[PDB]
Ligand binder design. Structure first.
Ligand SMILES: NC(=O)c1ccc[n+]([C@@H]2O[C@H](COP(=O)([O-])OP(=O)(O)OC[C@H]3O[C@@H](n4cnc5c(N)ncnc54)[C@H](O)[C@@H]3O)[C@@H](O)[C@H]2O)c1
Ligand SMILES: NC(=O)c1ccc[n+]([C@@H]2O[C@H](COP(=O)([O-])OP(=O)(O)OC[C@H]3O[C@@H](n4cnc5c(N)ncnc54)[C@H](O)[C@@H]3O)[C@@H](O)[C@H]2O)c1
Ligand SMILES: NC(=O)c1ccc[n+]([C@@H]2O[C@H](COP(=O)([O-])OP(=O)(O)OC[C@H]3O[C@@H](n4cnc5c(N)ncnc54)[C@H](O)[C@@H]3O)[C@@H](O)[C@H]2O)c1
Ligand SMILES: NC(=O)c1ccc[n+]([C@@H]2O[C@H](COP(=O)([O-])OP(=O)(O)OC[C@H]3O[C@@H](n4cnc5c(N)ncnc54)[C@H](O)[C@@H]3O)[C@@H](O)[C@H]2O)c1
Lengths: 333, 333, 333, 333
């Protein structure tokens, strides 16, 4: 059982930790966050507005965070290279601060004694992976990798099934995404793009995303045939992907439904979901799937042009994939 | 100046009235709503959460609603055929209850003495019109007409310009729409579709719409080449249309921008807007345009496949179009 | 084990049912709702935006609603007196439509064969009860009773403890309440009071409540010494009570904390809760307590004038009390 | 006409600027914000989610911000003492960063050439003032002053009138406040109090405030007789104060209504408002009053114990008071 260290106790850092202690697939032994001390970590991990109170025990004991009886070493370093991952016995490190996404910056963890690093976000140069799509392409020579983005983990699975069966000639996607820590409560200085600084509670905010283009990296055949954008809307969690694409081989909507369902009962079980139920966003709260095909919400213009809908809990789904990914890597050691 | 009667003092009934008194294009002389008495009408017309307090005077005087000094006759009939439009001197009647959308049901107003009826919603059989797209096709032989839907008035104008210039081979649209009176505050009984009864404040709700297909009625050439669906998100007003289409003639994004801008400065001025500003939904509050092209939010995959974005205040824009339409009809008498 | 029938499958009707099947304190055998058919009942009971998917089995089988293997008879009557409670074997009936709150109207259920009726709301004439405050005063001669309101079940328990220990000279309360089915998504025609028709998502809405005055009914000594009002804010669930009162006997805040805590560990265990944690509204989601004293949020001006804060899940807490109440009545048969 | 400089182009800095250009009471000649450059300042000042697009002209011209034709010098200093207020000709400086509230820190502006400094927030040592309550007590010997807080400017005016007429023995207040820039979109590291870091969109958040206690500073007679707390709820703007107090001299609610109304038509005209209308929070959007008594929402237990309600646009009201205050100071030069 691989021992893990988490850098950045945010929504993803905390939820990866929560997912790790639930499946017991990996063991969190150390956490680092200079802006959150031990006592605060207990409070933030225990209580969660969107996912409910933690089912288990959380305590500060001897300067360590104890979850379900397991003591965790706490670090307060601002500089990654300074963190003593080795002494804490952390073999893999989850880079989830959103500030060290380049292969070089995320590599700082290796100086501390870590053996591998998983960036919980897209990376400009590090190899990106998506469970159920291209994780098999991972090997031991890789020390620094990326688990892509929440949106990419939703689109890729669906795109794979659709492409493998009918071939995607070209596609454009839109994602109606829930607000995130990046946004502001009221009009304020955005970090990066001007629209993102506008009140998150009052507006529908157009935003760019490289998610669709990133699918071209995990599924090379689709490289350059996809692109899209996003809309941030005022909900705390759970998002939906709207994929509009031209098919190479004709396919009635019911054939697409048949194909996606089989994929969800087979290889992609637990990754890609399938439903014909009259669902709404909150029905996916704390759902661990990376993507769930919504049969009733999609629509086809004809046998070559269709709009496919898929839901995803951007916090929970992604988090579990980070754990699933590490579990996979460990089995390759 | 044509005298108008409004059936149903709801969001649209009230806003059409507000728009009428502002432009003075038409004169509201009577209103009918069995679930709202005179005093309540004063309160609901004066105060408006989304559009602000009414700039003017509103009062109950001698059993009449007096707006800016103009006395309005009030009716409390549940049955349309019973309303005495003729005695009140109402020549045109705005059917905005959402319960009499068929040519037959909306015709009841003619028995009361009305000369023409405008359904403020799509109709199964009545001829639909969209200002700036096919209003010229209206003639005096038509007693009962429809002004289409908020969403159709947004899509049609944009589709027209895009089709006239590059030709739309096929298109699929999605609309992220603000909540409406139809929805529920918490999970409850749905009037029609099951998902629509789910809490409007907590969920992103997939919904079907005939808007895209309705564009085929006002723009015959596009008949059968368009379709789409909707997502209801938790905002009080203002919506956005996402049009994904294949072009017949190649066109760089900048050519599309050039073409739409010219259209907004010419014939469609006041109907179709154009902006390159970093806008968000609330920047369109109380905006009277039927549709506003958002240059920076759209994206193109290539010269034949592109995603176009257009904003619309589903309450204010539509309302003004209802008045504009009546003003047009009147000039044809 | 008493057999129960539920009239009105709304937020309370569904949650009382959910609470009944969980504690197994009572057995739901029949449900009546003319606006929701069997199949719809399955969907609405299974999926819940605020409390999550039902943890059990829900199905339509032989025209009956089957929850966790227990078949429930479904009725579609609009008129209470017509419901055949007797044939279904329902001894107690939960009146939760919000339309039959008078002793006379709620009595209609007796004609159908019901033996007792519990109004899940305040009543103008039926005897009101609050678990842990005056349920002991219930006896078999009562056929029609009321379980008060969500807010009264929160205030009463706290007031009791505070009065019994220091004496309440006079008090005024305010409740910041989550939105409910009564409100509108956008400015529209209000049930009874004009402000209540304003958009629930956009405004803080002042509202009157008889809750504080009702405490004078369950705790006669406080009769006429309390009153208050409410504010509806844009959250889907969970509310908080702010009690400001003058004490007869002096009492340091810490003495009040000591006293309330003892009450929560003793007689009121499960009814009145106590916490010193840095809580927020969502930390009480699906919490079954009727009221939870928040030590850190309250504040005292002096030893006789203080402001006490108590949280309550207005949906879940109340629902469990309805079941607890019926369980109590049954033990008195 | 006094020339003004604004330090910190945030919600208050921008709205003070907007209010200044509207009333023309003062002339903004310079603005300083190291996290917002000229072009960004144009965008943020022009578009406003809660108060609408700016009515006028805003442009970047020759490295200056030009509003309605008036050129404004832009500074990018992080350190107050470095800002060249003197060269820009700024006589008064509005300290609205929320980071320099002490008399010493805010004094740094004097080194740059400023003559006076107004802290747009409460201060630990600088003299606090509230228009219509104690501004007359301001004199030329004061170089550094405070305009108190949004909440204090709401409570003080009302308390004054109530105290002057019936005498306040003791009082406790609660304020249901809209979210602010301080809060987070999702559970995250709070700057300061632990509850304040919880998702602003999902929770009702208890918060402490020194507002009630600060009234004891602007109205010495009430010193030590008032205190209270706050609740942050999910609305973008507009807040309400709930004052519960014991009166020295008996007073029927209607006498309180008579007294407050007279005060709003007299001396406090423009500061303290009065209404008997069925209002809700959004009816106060962009309302420049510091406080507006809501007759219909309040309630009295008896002639000595009552609950008074007052609304306030925490952004707009406060902003205008900052300008009004400077206008007053200038008339004393
Ligand atoms: N928010 C989502 O739903 C979501 C889903 C998938 C992927 N992601 C990606 O994962 C990352 C995590 O985002 P998140 O929502 O958890 O954000 P977050 O802001 O909640 O978490 C970031 C954490 O980083 C900590 N931190 C900041 N600087 C640090 C430093 N120098 N060293 C160590 N720790 C530091 C912060 O204290 C905080 O707890 C982002 O890059 C995001 O793009 C987020
Ligand atoms: N709401 C929008 O933004 C929008 C945009 C485009 C089209 N529409 C369509 O316009 C219609 C107006 O919808 P709305 O949003 O104003 O709904 P609403 O509920 O706000 O207003 C409808 C009004 O109809 C009144 N009414 C009900 N039965 C009546 C009867 N028999 N006679 C007279 N009045 C009666 C109701 O009391 C209410 O005041 C609907 O068909 C809607 O689909 C709405
Ligand atoms: N919502 C709360 O948090 C809460 C807490 C305590 C008490 N209550 C009280 O409980 C009652 C339940 O309110 P609710 O919030 O669940 O509202 P709701 O609208 O969610 O539920 C009411 C149900 O009544 C049904 N109904 C309507 N007319 C009927 C009829 N003639 N016969 C049978 N069923 C009929 C409706 O279909 C609906 O399912 C109200 O009286 C309310 O005051 C509610
Ligand atoms: N938000 C309200 O409605 C309201 C009402 C009354 C009083 N106040 C008080 O006024 C102050 C203003 O709050 P706000 O809502 O505008 O917050 P804000 O974050 O919107 O504005 C603060 C501004 O400070 C700038 N800034 C940060 N460090 C700086 C530095 N060293 N030099 C110059 N500029 C710097 C930021 O870029 C930002 O634009 C706060 O102390 C607040 O408590 C706020």
């Amino acid at each position: 059982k691989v021992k893990v260290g988490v850098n950045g106790f945010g929504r993803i850092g905390r939820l990866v930790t929560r997912a790790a202690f639930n499946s017991g697939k990996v063991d969190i032994v150390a956490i680092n966050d200079p802006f959150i001390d031990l006592n605060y970590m207990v409070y933030m991990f225990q209580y969660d507005s969107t996912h409910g109170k933690f089912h288990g025990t959380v305590k500060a004991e001897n300067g360590k965070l104890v979850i379900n009886g397991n003591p965790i070493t706490i670090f307060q370093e601002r500089d990654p290279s300074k963190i003593k991952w080795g002494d804490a016995g952390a073999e893999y490190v989850v880079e989830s601060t959103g500030v060290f996404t380049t292969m070089e910056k995320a590599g700082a963890h290796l100086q501390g004694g870590a053996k591998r690093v998983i960036i919980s976000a897209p990376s400009a140069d590090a190899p990106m992976f998506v469970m159920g799509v291209n994780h098999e392409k991972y090997d031991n020579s890789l020390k620094i990798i990326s688990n892509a983005s929440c949106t990419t983990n939703c689109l890729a699975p669906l795109a794979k099934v659709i492409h493998d069966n009918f071939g995607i000639v070209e596609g454009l996607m839109t994602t109606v995404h829930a607000i995130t820590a990046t946004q502001k409560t009221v009009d304020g200085p955005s970090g990066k793009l001007w629209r993102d600084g506008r009140g998150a509670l009052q507006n529908i905010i157009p935003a760019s995303t490289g998610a669709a283009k990133a699918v071209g990296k995990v599924i090379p055949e689709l490289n350059g045939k996809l692109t899209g954008m996003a809309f941030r809307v005022p909900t705390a969690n759970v998002s939906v992907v709207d994929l509009t694409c031209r098919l190479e081989k004709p396919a009635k909507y019911d054939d697409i439904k048949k194909v996606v369902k089989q994929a969800s009962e087979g290889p992609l079980k637990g990754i890609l979901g399938y439903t014909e139920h009259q669902v709404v966003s909150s029905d996916f709260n704390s759902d661990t799937h990376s993507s769930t095909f919504d049969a009733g919400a999609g629509i086809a213009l004809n046998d070559h042009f269709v709009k496919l809908i898929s839901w995803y809990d951007n916090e929970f789904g992604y988090s579990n994939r980070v754990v699933d990914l590490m579990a996979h890597m460990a089995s390759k050691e």
